[PDB]
Amino acid sequence: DYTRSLFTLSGPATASEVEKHIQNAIEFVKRRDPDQVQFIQAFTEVANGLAPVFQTDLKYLEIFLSLSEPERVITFKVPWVNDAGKLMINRGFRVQFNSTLGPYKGGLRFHPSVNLSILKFLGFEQIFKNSLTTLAMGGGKGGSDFDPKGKSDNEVRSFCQSFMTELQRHIGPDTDVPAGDIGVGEREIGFMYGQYKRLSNSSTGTLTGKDPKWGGSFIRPQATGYGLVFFVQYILNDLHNGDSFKGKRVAISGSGNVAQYAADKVIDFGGIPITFSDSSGYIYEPNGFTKEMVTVLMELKNIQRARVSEFLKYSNTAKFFPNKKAWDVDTNVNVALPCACENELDKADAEMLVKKGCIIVGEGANMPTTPEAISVFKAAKVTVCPGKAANAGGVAVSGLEMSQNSQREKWTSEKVLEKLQDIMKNMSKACQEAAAKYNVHGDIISGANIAGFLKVAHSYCDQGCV
Amino acid sequence: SDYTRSLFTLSGPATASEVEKHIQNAIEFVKRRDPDQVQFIQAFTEVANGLAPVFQTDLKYLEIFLSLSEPERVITFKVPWVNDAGKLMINRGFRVQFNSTLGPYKGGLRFHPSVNLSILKFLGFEQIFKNSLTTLAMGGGKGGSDFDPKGKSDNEVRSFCQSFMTELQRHIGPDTDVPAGDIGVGEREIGFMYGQYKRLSNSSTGTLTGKDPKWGGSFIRPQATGYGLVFFVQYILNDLHNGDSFKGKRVAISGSGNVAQYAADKVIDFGGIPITFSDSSGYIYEPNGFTKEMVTVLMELKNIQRARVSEFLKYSNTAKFFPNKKAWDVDTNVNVALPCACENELDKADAEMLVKKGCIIVGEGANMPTTPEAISVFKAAKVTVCPGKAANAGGVAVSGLEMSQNSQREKWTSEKVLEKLQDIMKNMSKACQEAAAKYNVHGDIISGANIAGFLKVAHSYCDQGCV
Amino acid sequence: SDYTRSLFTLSGPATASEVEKHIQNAIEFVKRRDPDQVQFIQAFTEVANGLAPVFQTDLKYLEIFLSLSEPERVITFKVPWVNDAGKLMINRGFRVQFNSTLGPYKGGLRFHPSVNLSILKFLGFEQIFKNSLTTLAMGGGKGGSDFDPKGKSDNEVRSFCQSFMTELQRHIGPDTDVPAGDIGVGEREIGFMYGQYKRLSNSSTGTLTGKDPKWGGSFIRPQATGYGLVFFVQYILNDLHNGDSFKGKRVAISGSGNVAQYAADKVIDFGGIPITFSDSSGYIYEPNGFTKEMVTVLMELKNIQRARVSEFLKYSNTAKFFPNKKAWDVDTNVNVALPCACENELDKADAEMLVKKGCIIVGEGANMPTTPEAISVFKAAKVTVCPGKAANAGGVAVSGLEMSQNSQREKWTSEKVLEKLQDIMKNMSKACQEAAAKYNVHGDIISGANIAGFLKVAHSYCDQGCV
Amino acid sequence: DYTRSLFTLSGPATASEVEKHIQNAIEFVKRRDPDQVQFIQAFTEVANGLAPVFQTDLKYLEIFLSLSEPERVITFKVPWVNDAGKLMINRGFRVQFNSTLGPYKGGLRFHPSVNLSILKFLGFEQIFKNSLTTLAMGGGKGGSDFDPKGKSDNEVRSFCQSFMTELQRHIGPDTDVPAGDIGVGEREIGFMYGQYKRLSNSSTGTLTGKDPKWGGSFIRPQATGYGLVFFVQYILNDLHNGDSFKGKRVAISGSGNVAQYAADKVIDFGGIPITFSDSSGYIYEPNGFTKEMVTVLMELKNIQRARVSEFLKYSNTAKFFPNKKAWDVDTNVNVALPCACENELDKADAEMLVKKGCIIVGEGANMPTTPEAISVFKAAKVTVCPGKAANAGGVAVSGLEMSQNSQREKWTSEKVLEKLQDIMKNMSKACQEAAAKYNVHGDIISGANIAGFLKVAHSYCDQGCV
Numbered sequence A, D: 001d002y003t004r005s006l007f008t009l010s011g012p013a014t015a016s017e018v019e020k021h022i023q024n025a026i027e028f029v030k031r032r033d034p035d036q037v038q039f040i041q042a043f044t045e046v047a048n049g050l051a052p053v054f055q056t057d058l059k060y061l062e063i064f065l066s067l068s069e070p071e072r073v074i075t076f077k078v079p080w081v082n083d084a085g086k087l088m089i090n091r092g093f094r095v096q097f098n099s100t101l102g103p104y105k106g107g108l109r110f111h112p113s114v115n116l117s118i119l120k121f122l123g124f125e126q127i128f129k130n131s132l133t134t135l136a137m138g139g140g141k142g143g144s145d146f147d148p149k150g151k152s153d154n155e156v157r158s159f160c161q162s163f164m165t166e167l168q169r170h171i172g173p174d175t176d177v178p179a180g181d182i183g184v185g186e187r188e189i190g191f192m193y194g195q196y197k198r199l200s201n202s203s204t205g206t207l208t209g210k211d212p213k214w215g216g217s218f219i220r221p222q223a224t225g226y227g228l229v230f231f232v233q234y235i236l237n238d239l240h241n242g243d244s245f246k247g248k249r250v251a252i253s254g255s256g257n258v259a260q261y262a263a264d265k266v267i268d269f270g271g272i273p274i275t276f277s278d279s280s281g282y283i284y285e286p287n288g289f290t291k292e293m294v295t296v297l298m299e300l301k302n303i304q305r306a307r308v309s310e311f312l313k314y315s316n317t318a319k320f321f322p323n324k325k326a327w328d329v330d331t332n333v334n335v336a337l338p339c340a341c342e343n344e345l346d347k348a349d350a351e352m353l354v355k356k357g358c359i360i361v362g363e364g365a366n367m368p369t370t371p372e373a374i375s376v377f378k379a380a381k382v383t384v385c386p387g388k389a390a391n392a393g394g395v396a397v398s399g400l401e402m403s404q405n406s407q408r409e410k411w412t413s414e415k416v417l418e419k420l421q422d423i424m425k426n427m428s429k430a431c432q433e434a435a436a437k438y439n440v441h442g443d444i445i446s447g448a449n450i451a452g453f454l455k456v457a458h459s460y461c462d463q464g465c466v
Numbered sequence B, C: 001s002d003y004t005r006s007l008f009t010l011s012g013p014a015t016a017s018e019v020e021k022h023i024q025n026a027i028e029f030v031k032r033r034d035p036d037q038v039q040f041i042q043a044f045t046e047v048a049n050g051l052a053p054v055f056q057t058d059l060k061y062l063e064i065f066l067s068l069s070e071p072e073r074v075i076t077f078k079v080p081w082v083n084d085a086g087k088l089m090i091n092r093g094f095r096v097q098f099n100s101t102l103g104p105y106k107g108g109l110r111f112h113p114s115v116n117l118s119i120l121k122f123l124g125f126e127q128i129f130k131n132s133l134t135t136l137a138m139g140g141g142k143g144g145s146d147f148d149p150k151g152k153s154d155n156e157v158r159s160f161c162q163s164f165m166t167e168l169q170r171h172i173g174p175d176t177d178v179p180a181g182d183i184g185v186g187e188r189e190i191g192f193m194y195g196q197y198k199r200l201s202n203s204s205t206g207t208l209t210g211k212d213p214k215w216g217g218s219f220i221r222p223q224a225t226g227y228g229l230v231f232f233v234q235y236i237l238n239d240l241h242n243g244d245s246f247k248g249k250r251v252a253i254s255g256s257g258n259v260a261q262y263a264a265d266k267v268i269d270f271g272g273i274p275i276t277f278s279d280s281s282g283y284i285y286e287p288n289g290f291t292k293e294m295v296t297v298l299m300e301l302k303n304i305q306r307a308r309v310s311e312f313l314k315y316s317n318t319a320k321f322f323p324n325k326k327a328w329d330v331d332t333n334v335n336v337a338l339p340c341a342c343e344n345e346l347d348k349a350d351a352e353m354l355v356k357k358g359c360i361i362v363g364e365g366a367n368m369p370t371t372p373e374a375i376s377v378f379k380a381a382k383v384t385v386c387p388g389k390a391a392n393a394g395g396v397a398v399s400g401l402e403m404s405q406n407s408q409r410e411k412w413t414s415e416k417v418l419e420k421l422q423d424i425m426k427n428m429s430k431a432c433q434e435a436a437a438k439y440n441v442h443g444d445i446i447s448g449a450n451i452a453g454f455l456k457v458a459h460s461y462c463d464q465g466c467v
Ligand code: NA
Pocket: A405, A406, A407, D405, D406, D407
């Protein structure tokens, strides 16, 4: 330790002392930004998750507070002319929160609800999510209150070009590599890359989510679903004494890209997917979905945009249960993978799953499991894999896109998948060891919180706390 | 001509009631974008209401005004520094680069614990039109930090200033953004920040104003605001009071800082007598006026000894002190009132006394000294009010002259700087009158200053394609 | 002294016949390098022939001249932009950076469908020596696009200007290349391009001239070329016609644009009487001359209504109109002819009438107005011809004064700019006479302008190592 | 040959003629820098070592003289404030000696003895040492007369930040990549990286020796000691007819990272390390150090900062000999590894090792063996592995750190170790082949000098001698 003298708070502390210090830190965050509700909530949640670390050494709470101030925030006017010839002014943002582990990394959101508080909350959390990938990536977030909905393609191009005319000044392949998010998909990434390239007169990996013809990476559509299965597989080996997906009945909720590619990789590991779901209900195959059946489901949902119920016209064994969740299926379920939406698995759902024998839950979606549902799982000793780690496959592959751009070499699909699998392996071990080191063995949720923070905190001190 | 007409949705003349509703719509839009920036919202409201005569001629100006209210760029940044105890401190730094249509972003830096984005946006937005009025090619901006200089050692201020400029230097430059001093940022801080900027940039340029005259600074900088106030009132007296001047005028001055002191000196130069100075303890009064020698004595008490104005009674047998009273209460005739102390220092009752005491004109040395009720009293009495937005702009005008001297790599004599400052205030006073007359508020110099400052920016913004 | 002698293969004096063959070999070399650039080849040929007296004293000047004929840098670029219908349009943009020996590249931008590299190289090459003649530290350049502004909306011109400057900004700068206006690039386009340059560079500098006075522009810009023409002719009359002046002179002016209008204004200031203006439709004639009040009316018709000169007869009871005739046909005594309309507007037949009507001097406001046959007639008649390369350089002279004001961050009064323009034209007229006298072509101001412009560049090129 | 016309001296020359030309070159160097004793001595030693090359073509002597002038030297004021609040001014340096093969590369030294002569001497040799690694790296060296002794962590932080505030202007990932040296370890690299990152607003490999959490490489602490053992192992196989470290008693001098990890790799190859030494004396184990014993010694020297005599408290069989060198130990020695300091092995010590049966010497430190000692070994037929190649493992791994940074990909420890071993293998072959090509067969010292020089000399001419 070469930075000990810099910190006012140091040494061990009791749980009650840490609770008081956390509340003091929260009040300090509030006084600095009294009306940033989302950011304040995010700081409070992450701080509470790190209480075991703060008890061992109070310096970590100070570092946490120091990390809570963005290194740089750029807000800028974005003038653009709509198709009617009228000048429009929108607000643009790039929160460059932390660059300790690498260049600022995080998506861009174009949505009318976007403001500084929301981007700070997402950007702050992205620091530790990117940390967990093991890759050299910092944390950031940006976007605009520009609303793409109802706008023509030309209007989106006009906005993307004017937005990037300013953003290019603050980003770069070794500085800040933004990505997509709500309102920023392939269309917007492409428009922004063209403008960035024209202004910079350079072809670099300054954005991720690019098309494979010009710097993009394979496995991007599959990354999140595959990464979820990888993480759960490695947790089963590392925390369930050599257990595996093999022979496991896998109940999957959702019918989107995450659920589809999660089911494929489960079958690759010898598991049996038995359910898919949408807002209309869930479908169930007693003997599981084959890959060929998953392929049929993909075209119905992706091309025909149909409901899951249409699948029964293709399988004679398929059953459809209207207005029910996948957790209601009357069979034994060994693994539950919520891959649909937030708070989709509640206390009642968790109780059913425990009664049906599920040994582990993997969060494919964002915050799928309610806090009450988590409590039942902890009592039942059912492992919960946190989404911040289990669904990090997308950001992991965004880092692999940077590697390919830095190497000016496009990897084969097999190679990208191999490194994604290695990333989830190292991430799962880091979460387990972190939980064990702080005497919350098996609490992967705590392990993910600790592992992400500590790599940033220690690197911050290595670099002189600047 | 008009090459940007097609870009604006609102256009054409509008009635007074219609303009009132449109302004209210504009305010609501500003509120939704920044719902809790109280100071910025009110600043937008005040300036918008002051421009209603313009909006009635063409609603396009309201849309331009709304467009100008969004900063071109805001940079907020972490400022880590180590205090004398060896402990790491983190403060928030800001630079609001609001508008650069007329020139590089220009505006002071404030180091005070109350600093936040709303306050800096309010000051920076207003700085656009203040700098416009100087006739010089300067934009508008404002920055600073919630760093609290109170209780800090010189070394800690040095450490913070160097870390603050380590990030700020990346966003400023002699042709880009030229910051200056403000509350908490004086000669000490400007010097510390200039040293760091020079070291990192490996260049010697006019990237800050307020520099010492030994390395790029300008003469007349301490005197600029007080002199400029007297110049402006002098020119208004000539043009709107039929050749009147400061000659023979009894001038009640509030405040005892640099603005009040150098305004007093210039009043004497123009043949008037300053009769009062004041601070929080009260006001002092000389029935036959303060001489330049007496003003110098009072300066030493306030600037070196940091004493109260009452101390002056030890030096003058004729001086009278009135505790806990404002200078407007002085029991004598007052022809010119120059509020140079603080906001809302001249209220409705004060305006009424001054009218009865023979006041013909008010020159605002401080910011918003005269309350709205006081302004109504003066307009009914036909007492001219010279708005602070123009009358106290002498300081920023000389900061622009500092930039000119740096760009020319030539230090002007004090006489040359003083002449150009006087010429600036002359053209500014004429622009305010002409704007007021053109929009049928003849003699309303408050409206004229609002209009003249806004229109030069709005028209140049359209010339440049509204980018 | 001479430190670059060893670098040149050709050196020493040569006979007139030897120079003729050397010039042809130089021309053949230029043709082989650019065989189809007709305008550039002819421009090189004309200037080379005008410099034959110099080449005879030392053939190295021919080698220097040939070296100068290759641009230091030419940038051609695609300009994609979206029209009001939403359709992608691609035009070609150019910037010919011909020579920077005396200072940053300087020259206008032309937006016209006929624009190509040959035309821009011809104009840019001549711009080197024209800017040289102003005495100011300016190089030579030219740029533009085949974009056709006619039929385009203001918004479409804005889109093109912004896309055009998005690439051009990468190659220009206040100390590198300062473009200006030309055909198709006026106040609208300069403003649009300035906005885009400012946003991308994040700086406020004098990287374009022709700006509006509210943001870095200069007074006297509209009047500069017309005023400069009259200044130049006035000095030539004093120096070569034994103290003669514009006083009492009847001046036939061709054209009705800004050059002719402000030339007429300055003639009246000097006591002259302008008697004609002309258009594509014909010419108008006032027997007793146009007063400034009358010129003001013509300005409104031509600049605001953009009507033809025949409209003037509705306002003057004495005005006469002659369709399909040039102003030189006017039936009266003519003492001064000022062609300010177009190339080859004054032919041999026109010159003979003007001599018969008593013309003592011709001043070229336009470019190449006088045909080669017409020049011979005037030389035989001993009527002085003031070359356009010097006489119409007032515009570029003031563009240089705009750069000085930007570099100084100080706007000059109109009086100061006018005084400096007049002094420039005085030194230029002296430079042309002295250069002509030194090479034994006394009184040939056309050759004097060629020689004086070339030599300052040629000598400085050698000072700088011929790089 | 496209640069022949540029050189005044050319063609073959007799041995006596080469000696006269070398002496003129030395005098020319002296007149240019009459008081830079170390630099003059370094130029003289290398020039004499390259005499066989100069005899084949005198242009090489002219190239060598041309290389002796640095491309660029930046010396600069370094102002910083100590913990008492007092302004201190130190001198900073960066000698950017040659960039023919790649960006300037070399360590930074913070020590009160530092001056221009020492840095030119170290930087000049660094050119050819880096050449031998086969990696695309130039040569340089820098530092300051700042004395870390007696300074607090914060004072070192203050100096490092001010030092990098100027240095950052002259370095970069493709221009100059500094590294550590005496007085510049993990603490200083971390502090300087933090300052460089903040000022440049970028995350790149502009320093090596970084921590693996942010751009660092595995095997970096072990690289020089491991590389020394790899090199000697290959020389034993190639020049001692298939011999190896197995069963060899290895006397190691020094107790720093080089000596510790050299002992570690010796044990991997079946050898027996018997001694360690420091300024206080040397310790001796009759039956050798095990890895557990080396692990204890590492903790004493690296954490406790104690003298080697402390080891006797943990091993009953260890012996301590005050104020004596490890070469005096009374036993048979098969391999000598001087890994402590310059001129640590003198003529008398070499005589003892020959008497005790030493068959090969591996130079871990810089210039460890005196010229008199080298003569003893050459007469005795004891092979000397030159430090210029044998201790280049550290700079080799610093090049692998650069590759990983340029690839934005962290290699496994196994991958780094194999590439280090392959580099040392090719280097040992290059030294033998170069010595053979210039008819000094078996003179590995001469071979290392020739192989490093020729790649730079030929590449310099390829690039127009600019
Ligand atoms: Na790379």
